[PDB]
Amino acid sequence: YTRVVWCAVGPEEQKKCQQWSQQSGQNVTCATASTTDDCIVLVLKGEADALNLDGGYIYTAGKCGLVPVLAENRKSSKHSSLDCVLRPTEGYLAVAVVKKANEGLTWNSLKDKKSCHTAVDRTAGWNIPMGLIVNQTGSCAFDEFFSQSCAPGADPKSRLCALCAGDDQGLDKCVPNSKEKYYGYTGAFRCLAEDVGDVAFVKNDTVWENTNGESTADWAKNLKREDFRLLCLDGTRKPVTEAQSCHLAVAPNHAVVSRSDRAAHVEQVLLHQQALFGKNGKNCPDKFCLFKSETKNLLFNDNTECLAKLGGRPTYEEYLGTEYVTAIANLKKCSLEACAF
Ligand SMILES: *[C@@H]1O[C@H](CO)[C@@H](O[C@@H]2O[C@H](CO)[C@@H](O[C@H]3O[C@H](CO)[C@@H](O[C@@H]4O[C@H](CO)[C@@H](O)[C@H](O)[C@@H]4O)[C@H](O)[C@@H]3O)[C@H](O)[C@H]2NC(C)=O)[C@H](O)[C@H]1NC(C)=O
Ligand SMILES: *[C@@H]1O[C@H](CO)[C@@H](O[C@@H]2O[C@H](CO)[C@@H](O[C@@H]3O[C@H](CO)[C@@H](O)[C@H](O)[C@@H]3O)[C@H](O)[C@H]2NC(C)=O)[C@H](O)[C@H]1NC(C)=O
Ligand SMILES: *[C@@H]1O[C@H](CO)[C@@H](O[C@@H]2O[C@H](CO)[C@@H](O)[C@H](O)[C@H]2NC(C)=O)[C@H](O)[C@H]1NC(C)=O
Ligand SMILES: [Fe+3]
Ligand SMILES: [Zn+2]
Ligand SMILES: [Zn+2]
């Protein structure tokens, strides 16, 4: 009865969640929904307990009363061995990536080009770049900025979905889940790699994890970091090695959210689950690994070292940071006392 019901977004996450359920002796069970928003609703209804969310979604969930529980913490050597679970998160770098061969393309010549986004409402893939663009063009018509895009979650018949490809069969074009070929960090980077789009709004880690043999996936196998460039806000282009001096923003880390009344129980179960299936986990590589799914970033990002305890029991606004919260509210003024549900 102590059981935590995880919410999986789409069939692939559902399959991984089921594997996790089996290996956890049903200490974790699965609820599945087609989109992250639907999962948030299941949690609000009490039909699911938790799921790991990108900051843009933490904002949506938070307005609905859901809270931060634990955050993804990426192998980053700083904070010596203050162990992982106790190490404070540093956030990730949201970047704009283009092909080096696409010369002359800069942050200042993005209008009318083709873009690849992780998903509508996500932090590196949407909130940050579109916020910056609405800001600079002084206009809310962000649906008109890029000539075509793949922005999972947007209207499928719109130009924002024109570049999306759907699943092996063309079904689910533009759905905001892994069934869409170009969905998420890896999908948006793939959209760029395959030259479907001119620019990809992802995070620094994505570029590294899908180049120079780091991915053995067929579209990624042959990719070289030097064939890519980051777009700096000052109009310059730099090597992906320059991320720290050429990013759009620093993003909150993805984090597990739950209803406030279930947060303590979810935290407890998760800490026990990663002890078993996390990076150095007792049953990881071996029976199951919570943080692996072949660069597909299912349930959690594949580069997650551990889920870390938060500092000073954050409200969702403290967790996301005042800078980011303001940016989202300002951007959403184009589409304050919320919960869209
Ligand atoms: C941009 O994002 C990348 C990827 O997240 C950052 O680069 C990573 O930096 C980490 C340290 O800050 C490196 O972590 C360790 O990874 C392994 C652990 O075994 C060590 O060797 C590696 O072996 C693996 C597997 O064969 C390879 O993927 C690596 O090439 C590497 O040789 C490594 O010494 C280190 O201790 C991590 O490797 C590294 N990842 C990659 C793919 O380069 C980068 O810092 C970040 N930039 C910014 C500005 O944040
Ligand atoms: C695009 O839209 C607006 C244009 O400025 C941006 O919102 C503004 O963001 C700044 C920076 O976070 C806010 O400034 C802050 O002011 C508060 C007090 O007013 C202070 O506590 C902070 O130290 C900081 O100085 C500013 O308030 C905010 N303004 C309003 C009225 O919303 C937005 O950030 C831009 N979008 C992006 C993605 O950059
Ligand atoms: C399901 O969860 C329970 C704990 O809530 C796991 O079992 C206990 O774990 C502690 C510490 O890890 C052990 O010291 C206890 O003795 C375990 N209880 C017993 C009675 O075995 C339990 O193993 C989990 N189930 C699986 C299959 O992972
Ligand atoms: Fe994100
Ligand atoms: Zn910065
Ligand atoms: Zn506080």
From Swiss-Prot:
Disulphide bonds in the chain: C7-C39, C17-C30, C64-C339, C84-C306, C116-C191, C140-C334, C150-C164, C161-C174, C232-C246, C284-C289
Glycosylation sites: N27, N135, N204
Annotated binding of Fe(3+) 2, by residue: D54, Y92, Y185, H254
Positions bound to hydrogencarbonate 2: T118, R122, A124, G125
Modified how: Poly-N-acetyllactosaminic carbohydrate moiety seems to be needed for TLR4 activation.
Cellular localisation: Secreted; Cytoplasmic granule
Ranges where the Transferrin-like domain occurs: 4-333
Similarity remark: Belongs to the transferrin family.
Quaternary context: Monomer. Found in a complex with LTF, CLU, EPPIN and SEMG1. Found in a complex with MPO and LTF; interacts directly with CP, allows Fe(3+) incorporation into LTF and activation of CP ferroxidase activity.
Its job: Transferrins are iron binding transport proteins which can bind two Fe(3+) ions in association with the binding of an anion, usually bicarbonate.
Name of this chain's protein: Lactotransferrin
Naturally occurring in which organism (per UniProt): Bos taurus (Bovine)
Shown chain mapped onto the complete sequence: 361 to 705 of 708
